[model samples]
Target chain A: FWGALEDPARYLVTFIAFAQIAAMVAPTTAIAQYFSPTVKGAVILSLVWFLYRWKTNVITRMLSAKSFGGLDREKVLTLDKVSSVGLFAIGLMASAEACGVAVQSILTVGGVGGVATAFAARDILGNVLSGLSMQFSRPFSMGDTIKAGSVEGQVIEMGLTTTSLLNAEKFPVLVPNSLFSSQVIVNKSRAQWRAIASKIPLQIDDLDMIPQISNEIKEMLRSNTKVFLGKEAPHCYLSRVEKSFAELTIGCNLIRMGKEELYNTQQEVLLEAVKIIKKHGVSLGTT
Target chain B: FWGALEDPARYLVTFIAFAQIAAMVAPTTAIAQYFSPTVKGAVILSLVWFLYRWKTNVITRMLSAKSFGGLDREKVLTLDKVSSVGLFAIGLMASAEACGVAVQSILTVGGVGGVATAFAARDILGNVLSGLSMQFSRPFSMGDTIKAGSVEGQVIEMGLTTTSLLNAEKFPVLVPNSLFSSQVIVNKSRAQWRAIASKIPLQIDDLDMIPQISNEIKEMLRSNTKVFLGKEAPHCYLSRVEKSFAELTIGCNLIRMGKEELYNTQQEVLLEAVKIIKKHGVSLGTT
Candidate 1:
């Protein structure tokens, strides 16, 4: 109970930590009816690996996690590339050896356990690689608004095997990291300049009216004089033509680097387009 | 190779089926030097499982799949809820028997092969479950405008691990089926009534203007007499009051059910709300 135990706080901090210590002690002590070197060596290797994981765990908690209990889930932490796996491999090897499987057979994949593990890993090599990269790249940090390919949501809790985010409707989406990694991720929170893209539709008979409608909407945007006419002039393009109506898209980049500004700008554009379209007498077909 | 097969067309129709047959016949008939009746029984059960799987395969291809190659990529077919795990248990038992491994030992704790298989399936199993349910449920078909949680996209093709949708940006998006299942899937393509919801941010100090702004936007929408004032009148509310901005949201349901019409209406609301805010001369706060 002494706080004097170095990271005694960490030792008791998690079940795995305690379990690691138990694995190191319990197996060797129980099996030590013989004070055999392999038993002691296995115990040592297990403790060392446990300690390494402990350090990584502590460091991860220390660096990546602050004491915000609200979203205080442990961030996914990894010890970068190749060598991290080496520790676990050695620890696993030591344990397997203690279980009567020879070390040489494992390396050569001659042992049944070794061969079985190899085949298993081989079957899911794609998912493991993907999960590995997802943790390593640290794409969207916790609470970041992410648009990974099709999924769009605010990171809720970065769940394992998936990235979890809540959409505007406040629904949680859990996406497998493999599928998320393949996407061109759009992070709204981790950027400087803001860009918004949206569409507007027009009456088909208004083909002659498109240029005028585009200009009027542009003129409405031009009045903002802040987000627009700063970095880029507001741009409109003929996006799609349909049987009953045509769709035009208005896109702009805000000089101001803020989320609210983009929202405000979008609204301004929305309000103006409607006013302009109404003025043009093309009733905005029923709601 | 034989027209002599009623299901022969079905038998040669799949290599996996005959592969199952081969697993049964080759392991049993030729090698039937079985150690015991139990071994023979297990193998026979495995063959029956093989036969059942063969039936499912033939039935799936015969009933569901026909001559379409684009989305026809094996369909990520699965043993949903029931085609389920029958084969793995039976095959594993058969193999154990054939190998002379103690059936009781395996029943207690399947030693190496069991652990290996568990790992191999660990990664793909998530995808397999998600893929299994997505296909089995037959939720959204091709070209459906689906809002599975926050993702809004038109189904382009249903891929193996993911759904291929063309987002409104006209870019292809691949969403893993797992996330797709967890969401409250809203299918616009298959629905009758249409709804739209979007928000705009304003200065919190400018909150006094919200009611007036909300009423004005509502009045503006009411003029449409189309989407607005149909099943539900156009309504506006102050959704959130944050430190810097008070967010305003407009929600409406359209009467007639055309996807294009609803989209056009959203743009109208967006343009109208911004115009109303600017007309009142309150600058929205920076994020």
Candidate 2:
């Protein structure tokens, strides 16, 4: 009969009813399983009651406002707080249940046996710890380019046992957590500067002109502002010579550049070098 | 004794000595087990002789230069070419040996069993194919914040079979490549914008003063121009009200902002709201 007095009140009553039913059901199930069902049930019911009350207060505040858009900030803030409380309560309950389960399992296994079991699963535990360390240390975060061990890929997920990485191939790679703790990981995304090295081969006929080409390439690299200054000097080195051709190793450093930019710069430099050599009638060595 | 002489001719003697040692060692090792040991040894000896001659030419070029740094670029380029050729030869030799082993294995297995084994090893083949596909698709890269399936973390590695993610708890989660291929993944690191939702609570007594407090929040959000315009507008909504207190939900969009910036903005906004409410002598709800 009171529900007939207001449409909003009717909805509020309906919400509360649903919440109570859920609370009742959950506790009964817990009790059936010989858990701390009464406490759990009381906590759940109390949270639901608080949430419903908060919801009703918000609706009343909104209705009393001068305009729909001009909401009472304090009311909204209060709602936020209550919601947080609800979330915290839920988290606490879950943690409690988890702790209970864990305690029981440990007791069943006994201390010495449990320790042995942990030792047998050392790698998995190591991985979990490494993952935890990654969370705390945060050497590199998601979206940062990283090279760990021999694998290179974008981070896709972080879990309890492994890190998920997506590579250039759009494939996901799962690396064990143990590996993260054990290996040297290069965080390319966080680097202030990146160095790129390229090797160019020239035929025997181009040997006499190598100095000229090297100088020209150095000049070209210097002209690009994207290249890191002072931190790295562009260098072209004559690494090896053979009957058929000569090999030149070119190195350049770029500041504040990403992988795509790095690749593009290398391509541009190589293309320019190729053009200059061809103009001089020098035959380039085949790949 | 020949070391005293600066003639390119002296290096030939050294090359001959190295060749003799290699010849003596080749017959009894795995190096000669797969191919014609005598022929392989002879080819290697000839290549070494060629390399010695090339080295002599480089020494001549270096000696003629005015300064070590001013050595002819062409000579260096020639060296690089020769190195590449030598590498290719080595790679080809390895490939031939691998082919020989594969063929022998296939022959020993016989036709039916070979086909059955191939079929049985589909999991490995699938993993390889998935790895290849991931390499090409280029989704999230190393250091990308991503959520895949139930796991969320920073990618630590991408491998042939699994993707590794390091999560907030510092645990590494390894997800199979096949599972990743079949699931939907969210890449947060690369997101251009993110929406942040926060809550605040106030006592029932402060209901009348909510609008003014909300306006203050709006003004504060407006002052931060670094936040993306149009994409995100900071606002507050009255979400819930209870017998004792009310709940408020505040939302803002982080435009073109990194995770750190996003977090900072949310923190600032919430703190600002708290200060405003306290200054107005507003009391919060009881625990």
Candidate 3:
């Protein structure tokens, strides 16, 4: 009946199988439901504690083992824990029902109290559960650089209520979980390249500098494989012809950045471009 | 029995109690639940619709007549409807238990179904229900200039799933309702005066003229009573001392702006400041 029983990890699976069979036996299942509400509640709570331990086993044995499903076995475990909790909840409700300790009271409290709670604690619930949703469907992991709504930072940590981001100024941005779900989350680390749109402002003395600045940046992206490169020919054109200083929209591609690198690619291109624009004597960065 | 019903609204409550008596005596509750699941569902739907109408009246008359519990007659009636439906659901469940429809099936479906639903339709549900939160709490109203998450614009309208913002470009900015709930909303119109930090850049070799330019703008704020001034004296200092252009960080204050005037005050101040800065041929607004 056990194909992998010959393997070493199968020893753990064998023990788990025995435990399940022991739990499913007629005596234990009946005894669990045999008691009055108080005892039954205690029994169910113990069962939940057991489930929690088993949850840890399942993650360590299944997800962490090398590519059982041909994918990366990395930070997804955090998200998987959330997916596991949902199953735990559904199982807890079912077991609690037969024990007579939970069902009716939960139905009563969940329906009536839920409405009143929706009014008073909508933000609280929204933030917490929305974090659950974010965890299950992880668009970005901890330590990934991402952009959403008002926040653009490296994700330092995630919790049930908030996702912590460390910003450019070395300040932490704590986003309410429900709130980040509402914004467009872009995982920059996951992408191959990022489009750079910078306003390179200079004096009104030129249509002359467009091709010159474009070529320098294009050369940087092409030859400067130390870290940067061009996806295609650089696009430097006059985006806005202002009254005093016309803004040349320098649009190009940088090797997509990651969490650890911070804004190395953005600054690399900008520092070089600043040196180029400064030679032409254009006002900078204060904008 | 009539303890809290001494109010005039009790007159309507009394009639509702009488109708319930009539319904029970005639077994109308049973009749509603006796039908097949489809028919019972239809009956419940009709009752919900009828409750929806009554909900409208309660808000209009009671909330409009006076500050009932200090809550205004606002647009939170949609959220109040959710509160109403919960009561409606509990009553239907008790009544439906009498029929052979196996109401237990509903209990099973709802919990398991709810989890599946949160996964499959998270964004859709988050957006819709968060809008419920928005409608009820109403952190920002239509036509208010609000900032939260990624959206900063004049709110033109709100709907079941999104908010419509008319930005400076006159294009409508649509934000998912769930995402908006997640952000900190600032009502600009509700705020006090706004702070202005601007830069006026000029040619070099003018150490003596710094105080002279500072007084010229200070007089503008002092004399121009239209919409710009603070109780404190204006702060103008030489911020950026560059080669060709020595930039002055002209810090000033504008009287609080509002939802109605989009950029009238900002542009107006800029127009006047430019004329002053240009008198000395200083670079302006380039940053």
Candidate 4:
């Protein structure tokens, strides 16, 4: 604990101070005087740096524990850079002052320059802000399949400025945070069901049998376990009739299932529909 | 507003305060008060860094006329790197208090390293709070055509932490923004209409010509004016029949036309239903 080290630290400081005082009166007073401040400045700045490093480590540990689950988070990484740059700058200034450079004028310059820096780094600021917003709004969570701004894929990783998505082709996509605000996001993964439609065409001469075919198809869909028969259930109808063919249309919702399952269900239904139409002596009207 | 250079800036600050009061009585008042506070803390920190570069060039010409019309927008380039790392950490705490060291324990080690740099920049503060929550959650602007998560495309540049999308093969995607908070964005340019399904197969012996080819393909999609017959009109059907192909399904709603005028009106209604099913004989039903 720092409490226990207090006296020891004081002793060191006193020792250094005593040495410097002796040097001030030494025959080489000029060099001693010049060397004293520079040494002291360097020591103090280095101490500051050490403290910063220690604190940063502690902070990083806490943040990881709090949310990142020990994973390297962007916030922690970026902050490290920010502090590194900051401390580096500070060290330079301390060195300059110890070497007899003006410190006040530097501050004035920095204050003024800060304004410009703020303006220039506006975009970075904006991204940080946007990332923060998403952290709270949570329109989509990690692993969600989404369509945001132009990207469509499962969210792989979300960071402060960019989010990574593993798309259909397995490409890792990086999307910017700013786009989400002005974009209509489609979170497909959250949908309850998907639609399936099929069409059966027969020769125009099958006019008399058209009604029976549609009816049978409707019944088939209604019977299927994978099909959703709600509000607007499976609808089979005589949708269109061209000069040569009568088209039978079957529209229905499939249960909220994975893409493969849905595809399988649809294929099965279509095959069954084909069997039914064949039993009814219907031929596909292709031409 | 700095009219007439005001007495030549007080005659260059009274000629550098009369040569630092003649080097403070020259003889060596303890090396002229220790070289006059380390040469007046390096000439007032180099005249406060030349008045902070003349007040940061007049606050970057008033934030580029308050808007960035001249183009380099990103909040004036990340506020010029956050005022160049906050004036290089206030010029290293004014050069460690003008080399006297101990600028209050280096500002309590830079205020506990700025609370670990605000919790490791909290993802750049959550991407600047999700870019100010999408600059107010507009949900898709700037060239639009989005899909968010997996990264579709369009929004060329948005900044504030990576938002460049030009997909569709051009590939400049760099989205992040914390994945827009639980993502699901699909702002397909505000979509008015885009649903078209077509299938016309015949031959299972034509099933007696499938009701005049689905009533002449529902009167050619109700006399096709790019076919969007409201309330689900233009629904032609005889959706299936197998023993060797019998499928004709065209359920339509087109008219918000793009994608080459809805694929040229669904290929002119499947080539006019194969010239009206070959003038009604319907023999073209493959197989």
Candidate 5:
């Protein structure tokens, strides 16, 4: 099994060894063919270089695997495909060179034709460029919560052609990278601190007490040990008073607090305030 | 200063020092009723305990500053508020305990009222329960990408009252913790893998070549090293044939691939197929 696995490299070495043997035997076999000796010699030299380059690449791949946490399977595959295409391109150029074809023939046939093709596939090319832009600009990264276009989700993966997001429902939403880069993206995770605002609806009968309640709540917060004081004072506003209830908007600046704590504080304060109101013989309607 | 500081802890020494001074002055002073020995002694002991506890707490705060990372300004404020409220609660409980009131009387006055309030505040209690559920379950952690209640964002903070998400638009959306816990939540970042599908409009001129093109495309993908072989094979379906072009839907599974690569692979394959088609003189549509 091991010997079979090593066959490609072994074959290359064996071929080189045989080429050397043939080089020595070539002059004896075809002494009268003046051009044959030179051709054979050139072929042997080419084979040696080819084997050297191939072995070097194999070693490089092994080294990359050891050092860079192993060549990423996808990246390795991509490299292989790229190399194959590159080799074909090189072969075409070499054939053109050997044939002494006018450079413009290949240029017009490949270059202009490629340009035309690209122009025809402008939408796809645009998406490719957008993907590139996304890579460089990084409007969002993996695990970031984002809303782009009509889709909202956490960025699960970003690729050359598309971006995948896990939405609020835990369902995956895959978007073309091109569209992602070109569209407006909202990224909330990048903020230093988040200001959270909430509203509590108080019955119309309790409308007159909102200002007092708001002040007491503010004072309570000011006197509280757990409130982050330096950022900004917590604010309470009578945003609207409708026929049914008055909307009291309470805004707080969360200082170094995680998302959970911010909501907890608000609830605790509301409960405490409601207790105070109830103690005062005020009916604030249902909680 | 050191001696003064030491005096607080040197209980016996301070008591002796005070007793000696009091004895020396006893003959010249009339001991008032309020200053009876027993009452004075009790007052002094209470004062000493209060002072000692206060001093210990101060020291604890100072040591906490040095030993642990000092609480942020917001946390310090919150701590202050919480401590003050806790102290008030303690005082209220103490007063209630001292009153020696029958539990039945208190229950009679408050129980009926309490039941009414509980009925009215069912939602509030539900919200609190949901908040607790969110805390214990931890469906998403802080900074996790989540979609819940039609909102998607990085979980900036979650409080007892609400959950806040910093969405891709760089805006913060605050949702009640009750709603968050009760509703379905989608966690996009945690998905194992995703699928991507794209539709390309095939030209009406190539209608007869659809099967051939599809087969060739599949073959191309099978041979291509980038295609994830472990995943479902790439497939194409004739979605709809429009007036000028036929819509062909290309679909692939990206197993164990990052989001970006999934999209990129599809794009690369699409472009490559387009190149092949164009080379064979296939026109997609009239520009």
Candidate 6:
């Protein structure tokens, strides 16, 4: 058994053997005799403590690293907790055994009392389990503009039970976690593109410039940097021919626009369309 | 030792004693000889299992009850999980001991490896702990109109991670749990009263009856069932005298009104105010 020990462990065993031999040789000496079990216990406890430190520093950190493959963050954390508890229990058992303590009865009694605790903490456990579930099925992440229930705002904090949002009016809102389990969420920040719908009313003073105006507006939209051109090109047509004025309708999708970007692009495109109409000497209709 | 046992336990002890005697008398027989330790192990295992069931069915339910001296739901559930794990470990130890198996080595080895597992499952534990924290600090409950971040809706579901909301346009919004941790929350359904501000524009011909109109409108607001008149009574005054028309301002608070109730009450009160103006022979103002 001693031959199977590793180098560091063999050294420790040799030291312990030397101490035991010293205690045996000085059997009548109070200090040397008293050191036998006490030294052994101390050694075991120190070993257990060192093992826990290694587990935390070396093992856990490696697993938690982002570059350690495509492992889920939540899943990794769950494993951490379960193992933490298990390791603590094992350490406790080892320490007790080193001190010649009988843990069998303690384990039985502790188990009996523990069942009561489980039921009492149902909601808390539910929260933890539910949070884990959410990690697995993430609908929206931090900084995503989400509308949860009647609350609409930019998410500032996501707690286990309550979510905090900064609303349009700058009011902070707190929402409970249970509400998200079944409610619909609208993630505004995830919008792919902004729709462009511009309707310009034109005076039917001269029917000659009507078709020319439409063609020019369409070409202007096609040249716009922010507007989508291929697959579904920008369309400009005479949608309505009223007795007083005709309506020129322009439709397209704007790409890669943030909240203000969409408005800025639309304003620019509409201004260009107006310039094109003015160039034809067609006056804007007053409806 | 047998004499100190309970009646049920004593009976089991007696049966074991009889079996041991029979085995001692037939030592040459393989079947009877093998039965000694096996019977003892079976008896101990059965006792351990029974204790676990009783703990679950009796102790847990009693603590989990809502009326059990105002205990928190989350706290109770947390107790349940902790106890459950402890009990399981205890049972494992007891069963191993009964089978004459040494668990010291297993405990130490399990402890070492268990540390690695704990690191791997950090997120899961964090989620559970965060959820527990939320239960202690409830920001909003189910069915409340909460604005979390940019999401506004009537809370449909409150899960651990994602909260669901039914928004104004009937769209379902799904918000993640982490968004709620630091975000602000607005609970709209908790509003006590709806404010009423009405302005009535009158023609210059109503100067003679302006005081009468104001006085009568104030009295009408006091008599209205939906209006709050005690602490802060309805206020009516001739606010502005413009070149085009005179503006009559009315301010008050409405009580116990839902979404549509507010609009309905405001419409009724304003219509009644208009009737008072008509009764005083004042023509309506047009800007």
Highest TM-score against the true fold, candidate:
4
Q: Which ten residues in a row have the lowest lDDT in candidate 6 chain B?
A: B108-117
Worst 10 residues of 1 chain A by lDDT: A1-10
TM-score of 3: 0.36
If you assessed candidate 4 against the hidden native complex, which CAPRI class would it receive?
A: incorrect
lDDT of 5 by residue, B1-287 (tens): 23454445455535643675334346544344222332223433433444455544544554555553275556655565666543443222222222333323443333343345444544555554455445434566786677765587888887755778898796998876555433435665665545556666666433445656666766666677645555346665443332344455565545445557766776787887777566556656532
lDDT of 4 by residue, A1-287 (tens): 34433344445455555676434555543454555674666566555556565646646465655774353355455556566756666665565556455544344443333333454344545656787898999978886899775567778778786666654423445566666666777888778868877776666475887778888888888888876666587888876677777777778888787753654466567667766877887665653
When 3 and 5 are scored with DockQ, the better candidate is 3
Better model by TM-score, 1 or 3? 1
For every model shown, the clashing-pair count is 14, 94, 3, 162, 46, 101
- The 10 consecutive residues of candidate 6 chain A with the worst lDDT sum are A1-10
Ranking by DockQ: 4, 6, 3, 1, 5, 2
TM-score of chain B of each: 0.47, 0.53, 0.51, 0.38, 0.54, 0.47
Q: What TM-score fits each model?
A: 0.37, 0.33, 0.36, 0.41, 0.34, 0.36
Encode model 1's per-residue lDDT on B18-131: one tens digit a residue. 454334555432344333443444445445455565656644564467553223223223222223444555455555445443233232223343455455444345545776
Shift of residue A125 alpha carbon in model 1, Å: 6.2
lDDT of 4: 0.61
Task: Give interface RMSD, per candidate.
Answer: 13.9, 27.6, 12.6, 12.3, 37.7, 14.1
lDDT of 2 by residue, A83-196 (tens): 665455444444334423222212222332223333333444555688799898785777765667656666767765567765432345566666667777877777787776
For model 3, the stretches where C-alpha displacement exceeds 4 angstroms are A1-123, A126-287, B1-114, B167-173, B228-233, B256-268, B274-287
TM-score, predicted candidate 1 vs. hidden true structure: 0.37
For candidate 6, what is the interface RMSD? 14.1
lDDT (Cα atoms) of all candidates against the true structure: 0.56, 0.56, 0.55, 0.61, 0.53, 0.60
lDDT of 1 by residue, A66-180 (tens): 5633333343334333335544554455444444446455433433544555465543444444554444345567877777755778888764456678876889887666555
List runs of model 6 lying over 4 Å from the truth: A1-5, A18-25, A28-33, A36-38, A45-287, B1-152, B158-164, B167-195, B200-209, B216-235, B238-247, B251-287
DockQ-derived CAPRI band for the predicted complex in model 1: incorrect
Better model by TM-score: candidate 2 vs candidate 4 = 4
